[PDB]
Specification:
part of a larger assembly, 4 chains, A alpha+beta, B alpha+beta, C mainly alpha, D mainly alpha, B: alpha+beta, 4-stranded antiparallel β-sheet, 3 helices, 4 strands, globular, C: mainly alpha, about 30% helix, TRAPP_component (chain A), golgi apparatus (chain A), transport (chain A), Bet3 (chain A), NO_sig/Golgi_transp_ligand-bd (chain A)
Chain lengths: ~160, ~140, ~150, ~270
């Protein structure tokens, strides 16, 4: 009893993905819904992550990597391992052996372009812009699409700054 | 040691592959094996074949070279492997473990959101799950 | 603190409701969820022998399922003779975060669907059947009004 | 049954050649030839079926009944076999075990063709049509063309599969014998004071091989007052009657290629 309290979440997510996918025929449309809904979710989650980890704020991508992988530790109980840094330290890679949020959602649904981790991408970006870090997010490798490890990618695009006092 | 796997829905059978440890089940009883089940129900059902317990059925049904061991969940799913060995030195303990494994593999195929419950098991993954079960415990 | 994910996610579902249907929410969440909980319920109080059929009040199984998910106990459990009955609960988790003042009442059907959509059992009152309506008068106080799939 | 089989090869070995005690074996062969009646199988399965019913058992009685029917076929008395099969299809169809259902269906068609019971033949054939995706396509086509043949009187082509006696059987028949899954689509039930309704039902065909497009009829439902997709010009309803009117279709009257389905998958209300 209760190895995982929140295995509930992944099934809810599967419900949402199939509900949209029935609603909107295109993998692209649901991609935008996943991204924006991750955006709002990550906006919700980053403040709690900073209430617990109580980080100063991220002024350096090594710090950003440690912070977000710590959040994965504390939110999805996963241990992504930072790797593949940019020479300019913009890119780094998060090694998910098991995408926690999927437990054989479907290996073939007969649908490429349907990317699952887009919810993570939305969460990471919305979180980051709460802390004034506009970084784009995508997924270099993804088990479901035929890979062996699911690998998120983020590259430091711009340093947002508070303005207009 | 032919394990005619057969999950059953409320009434009908979602997946019932014909596999074992070595290779496919040649013997041509398959559809009439399911007919063995439709006599395991409507007859050997009694008031008992459905229960509200994780169902140990040590030989709810037996016959030559063909021994049925059953299981039922609160969701009324019928889980049945057949001991197709007049006898081999395997004792019911590993059979209980096997119904644990089959429970878990079936319900993790259930973990799919795409697959509507009550339909033929599409998952080649849940396939290989059953396949490893057969290759191991047969 | 794994709940925060689900609180936020259900919150955003409370947000978007497209006008095509009120509840686009199908129940596969409920189906696969009770199957999961019952993977954790690899033991429930029903006798080893198959013939002697004992029914488990899905009221009680609902209590336990809340402890597995909703974590807080169902309180006031009034029941008619037949499959129709109700739960009266003073506190509901998703409505614990809303102001207790009876002003935000609409947000219930997303709540009550989640307790529907759980496969039945042949023997009635066996613990798993589900088809449920809600009438949340007071905010924390959900009122899940049950109707069995049968009479 | 094993004994009858054993008798089969006992014969066979007796044809091999036939110096001490061998004549005794010969009289043995003859005596077991007397035993070739094998109606004892029928009696034993009779008792088995009764006893199985005694403990509320349906399928063992159902499976031993299929054994009875198959031995009737070996008995040649295909009539009783088709009687059994006729009783045994409904329960299989309710049971939904898609493996066994077609497996008994092919035998049931065999009995229908040998018997020449063209009515049961066409009914089981059209139910096979409705979902015949498990079997090979060309076989579905041959079934359909044989069906059209027999609706308009032409004998089926498997002439080598048929025998002159059965030819007589079904040439004799049809004197009394008279009269793919698709959907009924009503645009407007609960009629108001003034309206009209045209061809809105959609005849989906699950079979690959197309149903030949010649004709069709719908009989105006008496509910209240008495009155690859193919969409066409039939469009029966063009008049006015009293309101609060509902409709419900008995059978297709499927005059597309065939004359009528004779099997009730023409759902009234889905």
């Amino acid at each position: 009893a209760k190895k995982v309290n929140s295995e509930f979440l992944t099934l809810t997510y599967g419900a949402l993905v199939t509900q949209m996918l029935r609603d909107f025929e295109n993998a692209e449309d649901v991609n935008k819904q996943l991204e924006r809904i991750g955006y709002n979710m990550g906006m919700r989650l980053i403040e709690d992550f900073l209430a617990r980890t109580s980080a100063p704020r991220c002024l350096e991508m090594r710090e950003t990597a440690d912070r977000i992988q710590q959040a994965f530790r504390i939110y999805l109980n996963i241990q992504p391992t930072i790797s593949n840094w940019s020479p300019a330290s913009d890119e780094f890679s998060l090694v998910f052996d098991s995408n926690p949020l999927t437990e054989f959602v479907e290996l073939p649904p007969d649908l490429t372009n349907l990317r699952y981790s887009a919810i993570l991408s939305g969460c990471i970006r919305g979180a980051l812009e709460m802390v004034q870090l506009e970084v784009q997010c995508w997924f270099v490798q993804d088990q479901l699409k035929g890979d062996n490890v699911t690998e998120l990618r983020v590259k430091f695009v711009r340093r947002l700054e508070e303005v207009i006092p | 040691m032919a394990f005619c796997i057969a999950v059953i829905g409320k009434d009908n059978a979602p997946l019932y592959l014909t596999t074992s440890d070595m290779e496919q089940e040649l013997e041509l009883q398959y559809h009439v094996n399911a007919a063995l089940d439709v006599v395991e129900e409507k007859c050997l059902i009694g008031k008992g074949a459905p229960e509200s317990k994780e169902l140990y059925l040590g030989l709810l049904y037996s016959t030559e070279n063909h021994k049925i061991y059953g299981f039922v969940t609160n969701t009324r799913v019928k889980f049945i492997v057949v001991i197709d060995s007049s006898n081999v030195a395997l004792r019911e303990n590993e059979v209980r473990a096997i119904f644990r494994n089959l429970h878990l593999l079936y319900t993790d195929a259930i973990c799919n959101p795409f697959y509507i419950p009550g339909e033929s098991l599409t998952s080649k993954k849940f396939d290989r799950a059953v396949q490893k079960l057969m290759s191991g415990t047969a | 603190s794994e709940e925060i994910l689900f609180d936020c996610l259900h919150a955003e579902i409370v947000n978007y409701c497209l006008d095509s249907n009120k509840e686009h929410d199908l129940a596969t969440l409920e189906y696969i969820g009770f199957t999961t909980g019952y993977r954790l319920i690899e033991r429930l109080t029903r006798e080893v022998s198959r013939f002697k059929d004992e029914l488990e009040t899905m009221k009680f199984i609902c209590t336990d399922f809340w402890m597995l998910i909703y974590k807080k106990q169902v309180d006031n459990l009034r029941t008619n003779n037949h499959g129709m009955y109700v739960v009266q609960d003073k506190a509901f988790r998703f409505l614990t975060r809303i102001s207790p003042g009876t002003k935000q009442l609409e947000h219930a059907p997303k709540f009550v669907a989640f307790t529907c959509g759980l496969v039945r059992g042949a023997l009635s009152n066996l613990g798993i059947n589900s088809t449920v309506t809600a009438e949340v008068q007071s905010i924390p106080a959900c009122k899940f009004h049950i109707e069995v799939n049968r009479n | 049954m094993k004994r009858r089989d054993a008798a089969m090869e006992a014969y066979a070995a007796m044809q091999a050649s036939s110096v001490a005690e061998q004549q005794a074996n010969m009289q043995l062969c003859d005596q077991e030839r007397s035993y070739n009646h094998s109606a004892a199988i029928i009696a034993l399965l009779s008792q088995a079926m009764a006893q199985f019913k005694i403990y509320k058992c349906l399928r063992f009685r159902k499976k031993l009944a299929i054994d009875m029917a198959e031995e009737y076929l070996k008995s040649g008395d295909h009539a009783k076999a088709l009687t059994l099969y006729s009783l045994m299809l409904p329960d299989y169809r309710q049971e939904k075990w898609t493996t066994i259902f077609t497996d008994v269906l092919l035998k049931t068609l065999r009995c229908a063709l040998l018997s020449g019971s063209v009515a049961d033949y066409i009914a089981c054939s059209v139910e096979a049509l409705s979902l015949r995706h498990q079997s090979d396509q060309s076989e579905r086509i041959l079934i359909l063309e044989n069906l059209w043949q027999v609706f308009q009187g032409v004998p089926p082509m498997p002439k080598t599969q048929l025998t002159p006696e059965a030819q007589a059987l079904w040439t004799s028949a049809l004197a009394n014998v008279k009269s793919v899954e698709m959907c009924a689509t009503f645009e407007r039930v609960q009629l108001s004071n003034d309206d009209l309704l045209q061809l809105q039902l959609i005849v989906r065909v699950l079979t690959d091989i197309p149903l030949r497009i010649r004709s069709f009829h719908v009989i105006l439902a008496d509910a209240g007052n008495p009155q690859s997709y193919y969409q066409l010009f039939c469009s029966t309803e063009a008049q006015q009657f009293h309101e609060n009117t509902q409709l419900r279709i008995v059978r297709l009257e499927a005059h597309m290629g065939t004359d009528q389905v004779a099997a009730l998958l023409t759902c009234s209300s889905n």
